[PDB]
Amino acid sequence: YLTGFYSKDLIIEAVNMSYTNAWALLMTLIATSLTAAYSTRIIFFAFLGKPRFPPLVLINENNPLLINSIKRLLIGSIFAGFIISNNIPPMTVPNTTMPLYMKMTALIVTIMGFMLALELNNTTYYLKFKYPSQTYKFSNMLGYYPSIMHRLPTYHNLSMSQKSA
Amino acid sequence: QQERDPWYDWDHPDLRLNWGEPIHWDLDMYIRNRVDTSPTPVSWNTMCKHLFGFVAFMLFMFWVGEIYPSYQPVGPKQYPYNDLYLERGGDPTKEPEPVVHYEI
Amino acid sequence: YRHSIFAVTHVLIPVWIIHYYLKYHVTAKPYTVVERKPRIFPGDTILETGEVIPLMKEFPDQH
Amino acid sequence: DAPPLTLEAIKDRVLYVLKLYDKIDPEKLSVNSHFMKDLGLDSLDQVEIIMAMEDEFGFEIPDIDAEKLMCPQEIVDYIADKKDVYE
Amino acid sequence: PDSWDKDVYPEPPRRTPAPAPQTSLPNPVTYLTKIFDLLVDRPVTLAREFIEQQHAKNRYYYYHREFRRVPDITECEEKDILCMFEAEMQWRRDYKVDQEIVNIIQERLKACQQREGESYRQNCAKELEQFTQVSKAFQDRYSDLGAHYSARKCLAKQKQRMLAERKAAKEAAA
Amino acid sequence: VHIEPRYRQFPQLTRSQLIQAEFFSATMWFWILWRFWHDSDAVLGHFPYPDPSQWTDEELGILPDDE
Amino acid sequence: AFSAPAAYLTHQQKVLRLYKRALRHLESWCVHRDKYRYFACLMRARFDEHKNEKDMVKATQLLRQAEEEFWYGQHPQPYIFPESPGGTSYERYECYKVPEWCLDDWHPSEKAMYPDYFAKREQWKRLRRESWEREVKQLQEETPPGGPRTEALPPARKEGDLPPLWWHIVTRPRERPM
Amino acid sequence: MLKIIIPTTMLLPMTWMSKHNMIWINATVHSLLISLISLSLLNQLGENSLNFSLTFFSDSLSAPLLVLTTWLLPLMLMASQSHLSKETTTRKKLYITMLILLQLFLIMTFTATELILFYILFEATLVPTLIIITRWGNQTERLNAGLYFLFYTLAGSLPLLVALVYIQNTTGSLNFLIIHYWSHPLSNSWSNIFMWLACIMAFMVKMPLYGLHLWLPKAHVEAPIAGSMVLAAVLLKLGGYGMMRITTILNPLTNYMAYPFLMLSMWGMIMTSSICLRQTDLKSLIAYSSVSHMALVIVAIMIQTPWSFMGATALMIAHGLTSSMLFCLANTNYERVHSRTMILARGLQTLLPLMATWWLVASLTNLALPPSINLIGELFIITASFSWSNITIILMGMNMMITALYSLYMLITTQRGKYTHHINNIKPSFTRENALMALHILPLLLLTLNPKMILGPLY
Amino acid sequence: MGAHLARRYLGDASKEPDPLRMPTFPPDYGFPERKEREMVATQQEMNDAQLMLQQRDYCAHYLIQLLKCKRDSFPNFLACKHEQHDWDYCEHLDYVKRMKEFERERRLLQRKKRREQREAEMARG
Amino acid sequence: SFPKYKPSRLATLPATLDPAEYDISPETRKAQAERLAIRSRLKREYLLQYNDPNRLGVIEDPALIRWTYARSANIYPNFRPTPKTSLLGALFGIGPLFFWYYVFKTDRDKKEKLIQEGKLDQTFNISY
Numbered sequence A: 001y002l003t004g005f006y007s008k009d010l011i012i013e014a015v016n017m018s019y020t021n022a023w024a025l026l027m028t029l030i031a032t033s034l035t036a037a038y039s040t041r042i043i044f045f046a047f048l049g050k051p052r053f054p055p056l057v058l059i060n061e062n063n064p065l066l067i068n069s070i071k072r073l074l075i076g077s078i079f080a081g082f083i084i085s086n087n088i089p090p091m092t093v094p095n096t097t098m099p100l101y102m103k104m105t106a107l108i109v110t111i112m113g114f115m116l117a118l119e120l121n122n123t124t125y126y127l128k129f130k131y132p133s134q135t136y137k138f139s140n141m142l143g144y145y146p147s148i149m150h151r152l153p154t155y156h157n158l159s160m161s162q163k164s165a
Numbered sequence B: 001q002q003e004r005d006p007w008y009d010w011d012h013p014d015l016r017l018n019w020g021e022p023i024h025w026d027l028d029m030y031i032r033n034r035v036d037t038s039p040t041p042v043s044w045n046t047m048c049k050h051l052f053g054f055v056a057f058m059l060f061m062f063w064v065g066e067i068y069p070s071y072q073p074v075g076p077k078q079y080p081y082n083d084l085y086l087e088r089g090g091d092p093t094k095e096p097e098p099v100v101h102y103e104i
Numbered sequence C: 001y002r003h004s005i006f007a008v009t010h011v012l013i014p015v016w017i018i019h020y021y022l023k024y025h026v027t028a029k030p031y032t033v034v035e036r037k038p039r040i041f042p043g044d045t046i047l048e049t050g051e052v053i054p055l056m057k058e059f060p061d062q063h
Numbered sequence D: 001d002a003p004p005l006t007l008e009a010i011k012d013r014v015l016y017v018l019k020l021y022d023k024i025d026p027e028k029l030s031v032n033s034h035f036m037k038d039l040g041l042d043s044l045d046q047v048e049i050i051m052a053m054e055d056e057f058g059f060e061i062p063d064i065d066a067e068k069l070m071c072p073q074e075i076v077d078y079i080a081d082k083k084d085v086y087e
Numbered sequence E: 001p002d003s004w005d006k007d008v009y010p011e012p013p014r015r016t017p018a019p020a021p022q023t024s025l026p027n028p029v030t031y032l033t034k035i036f037d038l039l040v041d042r043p044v045t046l047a048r049e050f051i052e053q054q055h056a057k058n059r060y061y062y063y064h065r066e067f068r069r070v071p072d073i074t075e076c077e078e079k080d081i082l083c084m085f086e087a088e089m090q091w092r093r094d095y096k097v098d099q100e101i102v103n104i105i106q107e108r109l110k111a112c113q114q115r116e117g118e119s120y121r122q123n124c125a126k127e128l129e130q131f132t133q134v135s136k137a138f139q140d141r142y143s144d145l146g147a148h149y150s151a152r153k154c155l156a157k158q159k160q161r162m163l164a165e166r167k168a169a170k171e172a173a174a
Numbered sequence F: 001v002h003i004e005p006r007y008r009q010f011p012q013l014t015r016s017q018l019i020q021a022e023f024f025s026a027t028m029w030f031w032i033l034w035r036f037w038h039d040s041d042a043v044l045g046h047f048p049y050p051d052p053s054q055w056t057d058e059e060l061g062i063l064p065d066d067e
Numbered sequence G: 001a002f003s004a005p006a007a008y009l010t011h012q013q014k015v016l017r018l019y020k021r022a023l024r025h026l027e028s029w030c031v032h033r034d035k036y037r038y039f040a041c042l043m044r045a046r047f048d049e050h051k052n053e054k055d056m057v058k059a060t061q062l063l064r065q066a067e068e069e070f071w072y073g074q075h076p077q078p079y080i081f082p083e084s085p086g087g088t089s090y091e092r093y094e095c096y097k098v099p100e101w102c103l104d105d106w107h108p109s110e111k112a113m114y115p116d117y118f119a120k121r122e123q124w125k126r127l128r129r130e131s132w133e134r135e136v137k138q139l140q141e142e143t144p145p146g147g148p149r150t151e152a153l154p155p156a157r158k159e160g161d162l163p164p165l166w167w168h169i170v171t172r173p174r175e176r177p178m
Numbered sequence H: 001m002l003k004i005i006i007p008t009t010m011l012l013p014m015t016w017m018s019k020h021n022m023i024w025i026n027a028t029v030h031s032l033l034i035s036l037i038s039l040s041l042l043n044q045l046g047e048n049s050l051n052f053s054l055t056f057f058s059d060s061l062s063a064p065l066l067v068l069t070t071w072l073l074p075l076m077l078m079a080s081q082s083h084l085s086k087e088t089t090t091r092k093k094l095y096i097t098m099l100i101l102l103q104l105f106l107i108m109t110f111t112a113t114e115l116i117l118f119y120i121l122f123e124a125t126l127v128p129t130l131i132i133i134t135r136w137g138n139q140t141e142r143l144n145a146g147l148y149f150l151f152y153t154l155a156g157s158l159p160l161l162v163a164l165v166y167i168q169n170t171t172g173s174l175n176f177l178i179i180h181y182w183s184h185p186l187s188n189s190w191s192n193i194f195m196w197l198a199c200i201m202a203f204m205v206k207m208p209l210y211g212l213h214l215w216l217p218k219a220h221v222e223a224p225i226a227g228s229m230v231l232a233a234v235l236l237k238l239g240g241y242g243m244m245r246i247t248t249i250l251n252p253l254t255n256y257m258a259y260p261f262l263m264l265s266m267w268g269m270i271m272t273s274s275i276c277l278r279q280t281d282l283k284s285l286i287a288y289s290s291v292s293h294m295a296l297v298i299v300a301i302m303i304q305t306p307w308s309f310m311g312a313t314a315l316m317i318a319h320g321l322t323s324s325m326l327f328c329l330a331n332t333n334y335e336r337v338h339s340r341t342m343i344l345a346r347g348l349q350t351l352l353p354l355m356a357t358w359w360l361v362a363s364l365t366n367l368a369l370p371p372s373i374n375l376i377g378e379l380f381i382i383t384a385s386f387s388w389s390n391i392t393i394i395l396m397g398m399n400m401m402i403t404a405l406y407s408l409y410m411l412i413t414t415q416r417g418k419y420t421h422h423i424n425n426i427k428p429s430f431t432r433e434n435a436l437m438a439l440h441i442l443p444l445l446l447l448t449l450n451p452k453m454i455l456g457p458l459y
Numbered sequence I: 001m002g003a004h005l006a007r008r009y010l011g012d013a014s015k016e017p018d019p020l021r022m023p024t025f026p027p028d029y030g031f032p033e034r035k036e037r038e039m040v041a042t043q044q045e046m047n048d049a050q051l052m053l054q055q056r057d058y059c060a061h062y063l064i065q066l067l068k069c070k071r072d073s074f075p076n077f078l079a080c081k082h083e084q085h086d087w088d089y090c091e092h093l094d095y096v097k098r099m100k101e102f103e104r105e106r107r108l109l110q111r112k113k114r115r116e117q118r119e120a121e122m123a124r125g
Numbered sequence J: 001s002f003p004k005y006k007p008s009r010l011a012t013l014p015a016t017l018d019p020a021e022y023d024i025s026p027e028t029r030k031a032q033a034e035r036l037a038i039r040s041r042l043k044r045e046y047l048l049q050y051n052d053p054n055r056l057g058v059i060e061d062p063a064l065i066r067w068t069y070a071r072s073a074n075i076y077p078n079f080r081p082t083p084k085t086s087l088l089g090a091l092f093g094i095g096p097l098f099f100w101y102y103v104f105k106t107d108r109d110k111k112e113k114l115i116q117e118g119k120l121d122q123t124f125n126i127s128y
């Protein structure tokens, strides 16, 4: 019932209930799960556990400007979705009738991402070390897209710019 | 220059060049703002294979999902006045082929 | 006092200028400002002519 | 933003780290004690000391400069010179 | 408003529904509109009253220039430079007038689309047909003359079109 | 307010920020529970999904195979 | 950065640099402090195991194999200090560094806005001008006839002299200039 | 037109009779006054041109070019007084005389009503330019640059003279009004092909066309600052004006003869932008950017539609202003460090803030940034080329991407980064240089405000 | 999503319906007397209400009523629950009508398959 | 053992993985010493000029001058007509022109054929 519920849930319901591309639908569901996963990663590695910052503790978030700005953007993150959804006129026909499992699909995949990411992050405390996987290397290095596509085409264009023209 | 040592006291710290030393013919393209040649944790051939395989598999699966779409067990949606003939810009003078929807 | 001086200038003067510009200059040539026609629903009263738009027929009500 | 550093603060923090090192006896540790000549450590111990100081102060000392910091006073002077601390 | 011609720039009669509230809650839109009228509309109205009073004391007029028709390039003899000049100038003026006519029709089309809003595809069919006809005629007149267009070139194009039409009619009658 | 820096110690917190954080967390949870209590059809649905297997051939207009 | 490099790295220097790099990458892999302590102790155990080796060829072979292992097992995204060359806060304050030669092009009114600072600046300029000849003489006296064999510089051998080539090192912009 | 022509011929004796220290002041003041007077030519008619007399006429195409020339003269005076401080009084007066003669010839060229008088004047413009380049250039290569410029222009233009006298013999007149009214179609023959070739090739060499453009980097890099300003802003626009004037009698042969020139223009636009990407000299980068923009103008004139001509005119005016400003900025940098290398001077944003602002605005105008008249002209040309064919959009998009790339590359290289440590003679920017930049940039923005003044007769 | 996709793709697409071609049988095939659907809202009423062309279905009257209720009770944006429920229920009934059409098409197709198989068996025998 | 790393032109070989880094001849050490001596000589010259208090201007860099000269003015005098240069110039300078000419010619011929046959959608095409 938060601000993201009034848009993401309807989007997922529309994707599941339409004449869509099957691969696109599957990738959308997996992306929702991975959204839950990386939100868990941020929370787990930034807020939970023991300090890992330098000993000189300069932490101070008591500034009224920061507090009030985050407050104002925090009231919107709770209530603005309800107000906006209930005040705009109906511009699309709702998906009133659908199976219960399809109705709960967004929540189920979100919770599965939460749980799997939480377990994987919890395994980090073990005194166990292993070299990374090829899938991990692909994901961490951004699919190798910036490397190849920022070194090869740029090199060829800059080389033809001088050698040929 | 990205491969060049950052902890050395170069005469030109940003370009990582010294005064008087020979300048590479392609310095204009090998500056830190441009093409980089520094070693990567993964081999270049492996990176090319992984990226190409990923994009090709995604395109193939998008085509597969296009030829095998996902839908719902419902009939076509029905609209009252000859599938809204006049409201979609139909010619008032010409007579449309009637579209009749029944109860079920 | 600072907020009052800010409000009169920064808000009051521009709204005066823009309202004067729109009413007497922009809305002096045709089609410069076009408003989408208001929605008319059954069982309504058009105020231009005192007209009464009638209600819809009896619904086949369920439950 | 952050409070400025001082020579006394830098010296106190480096001596704090060194006294929390187990291989160094806190009682015989002075600011002029040499890491290998009179403290009996070796190259790997000195590397770990430099890494501990890097973690303490939040900045990296390059290997070319770190090999020559064989004394707490040398480390203090290096850090003060790099951070532009004169008092 | 009498500033422009209602026939040249038609507006459908405006039907505004009367308010039919169903709640005891006050209307913030109504309150803010009252505030706006009190704070902005009255001062701008007084300022415009003063300005118009100043304008009424110094009333003066400007006129619309009238051009009489002159013989066209069809009537002009070959290499009769003066007649060719007059005909070319008249053709250019007519070209400008036709461009402005097309502009008027396009303004009609845009205004009707915006006005009808969500029912534009059906309610703007009359303005789409007028635009189609006007644009068809304008294109047939001045479609592909070029950067160095002239009345002679437009006449040659019209002659070519007339020859094509005559040939088509003869072939149909054959 | 001036917060003195700490060395190797937990930072100095403020009652105001503590109570504000607690209030906003409680507000979020109250909003979630209050919305779920009133309109739970946004989560669990509002209308049942029919089973097509139970629709009779007579009402679906299906004639006997022999006929 | 402050030290003049040598012609080459010794075997001890290479192994120490590998030790530091391996420890840092292990810390990047082992996020938590206790896990990092455990695995760093194991890494130092490996280094101690290979510490005493009389065969230099075998020692170099061990170093090479360890380098290959490090390259295979390196963290693709190792931790970098913000001010370090790979860091996020690297070179952010370079646009804020302005030199004193630019400082002396000010208008007389601007200089009058700071009367006490420019008096000390003139004292520094006089100190610079009164020592350049002694510095160049010292540099040319102590250099070998072949030329400078290294980038090192000598200190001041005299009671009243200054270390040669000192001006820009001493008057370099502050690390947080503005 | 005499009310503008005579004041220049009076600028001459005023320059030669003024005192030694007052030449710059008098020349600048009276050049600005003449520019203000020439601002009255912008009041044009919608039907025909302004036919003052049998010899001179003005049009919606000639008026912005004349105003640009008259406005460009005082800026050239400012730059010249910047770089000619130690010259003798006689040589200062000779340089001012060369500039005045060039402006007079350009005015008479843009207002000439006959093609042969236009030819005479637009060829007379070569002598002052050649003298300026080969006399007040700084480096050795000025002589070779002048030779290349002169011989390219003359080898292009002599067949144009032969074609013009032949056309006069055949038709009876070279008067532009007569040849426009009495124009007849050009049949597909070898003789007509070669007449078309003579005229178009003369003006293409003047443009320049890709493959006929080496003289442009040669002359622009090696000319003094005033010469560089006049070469890019106005002297490159003589080719476009001539092509927009002669193509009246070259139809319908322009439909079939324009293919090689269109292909050369598009591909060489791409190639010169790519060359700009890898230039170690700032002046050369500016010159090649000029080549690319004039190639786009050539594409517009060759496709020859009412939407293309308006874009051509707007792009010519915008390019003149922008290229003049870029040359002035690069010349200030050169006067600082006495070298044209781009990577020599860095950190110039932290060393000179307002000049960094001027560089930013000039670079943003160099690339098509809306709603600037640069973008107006480029977008009109791109739309006309799209109507011509639907792969020209691919070529134009590639060119726009490379244009943004090299413009921002120049900006980041010259202004951003850290300053060179050993360059310690970069004095604060002068009021004269700042005023030069402001006078370059403000009229461009005002033209953006009022765009129908530079869209040509086809508007 | 659903078992129908599995049946059609990993099975007999001939017996499963075609969504892009449905219906392939006459509306009276199997229905002796079938009633045409009733439309409450008129074309002029929908045009005045400016319903989106997607929203001008057989449930348009409930949408018009909901819009009128929302406009009148504007500050109280929580006072149109009954109208919203009426519109949603009408849409639900339309959706179950579509589902009934799909099921009817499916079983008509499989009945046709059984009939053709029986005819083929009779011809063979 | 561990998978090998294959260097490329855009992903070079690291120093720690270079085989020659672990096979150091006594002549390699003297070569490194000579290189360091050259660097030290250049650095000393630059630092003397840079710390000179009476210097006002730019320390001219002959290396930069040589780079800019070899990039621009030294190319044609050292250019020779060879089969490689001739073929590369012909291709890179002529082939694109003919390619684009063919593309645009084919497109425009098809468009004009459609115009003559009268089956090209040109309604509302008023601006050209």
Ligand SMILES: CCCCCCCCCCCCCCCCCC(=O)OC[C@H](COP(=O)([O-])OCC(O)COP(=O)([O-])OC[C@@H](COC(=O)CCCCCCCCCCCCCCCCC)OC(=O)CCCCCCCCCCCCCCCCC)OC(=O)CCCCCCCCCCCCCCCCC
Pocket (backbone or CB within 6 Å): A026, A029, A030, A033, A034, A037, A041, A109, A112, A113, A116, A117, A120, A131, A132, A133, A134, A135, A136, A137, A139, B053, B054, B057, B058
């Ligand atoms: C050409 C292929 C094209 C493919 C296109 C399609 C791609 C689809 C991708 C799908 C998502 C993949 C997610 C994992 C990849 C990234 C792993 C990684 O690096 O993590 C490190 C990273 C931690 O970073 P770190 O702190 O640096 O830790 C360092 C590592 O520990 C260092 O340790 P490490 O390096 O060993 O860690 C990696 C290791 C450990 O990670 C895992 O095991 C992750 C497992 C995730 C869950 C998978 C199973 C889900 C089962 C769901 C069952 C219920 C379904 C629903 C129905 C229920 C009712 C019936 O993972 C693996 O070994 C493989 C994981 C799976 C890979 C999938 C892609 C295959 C590529 C080709 C085959 C390669 C095979 C060989 C591998 C390479 C060579 C050795 O992990 C996380 O942060 C969490 C990851 C996310 C967990 C939740 C994921 C939920 C969504 C996916 C599952 C589906 C849910 C339902 C969706 C809706 C359905 C309708």
Ligand SMILES: *P(=O)(O)OCC(C)(C)[C@H](O)C(=O)NCCC(=O)NCCSC(=O)CCCCCCCCCCCCC
Pocket (backbone or CB within 6 Å): D042, D043, D044, G011, G012, G015, G022, G025, G026, G029, G046, G047, G050, G051, G052, G053, G059, G060, G062, G063, G066, G067, G069, G070, G073, G074, G075
């Ligand atoms: P101090 O001056 O006492 O130093 C003593 C030294 C080491 C200099 C010795 O005197 C010495 O030279 N001994 C002989 C040479 C020698 O020790 N060679 C061996 C060096 S490498 C070694 O054997 C240890 C390597 C094992 C660990 C490799 C790390 C790779 C894993 C990293 C993966 C990255 C993420 C974990």
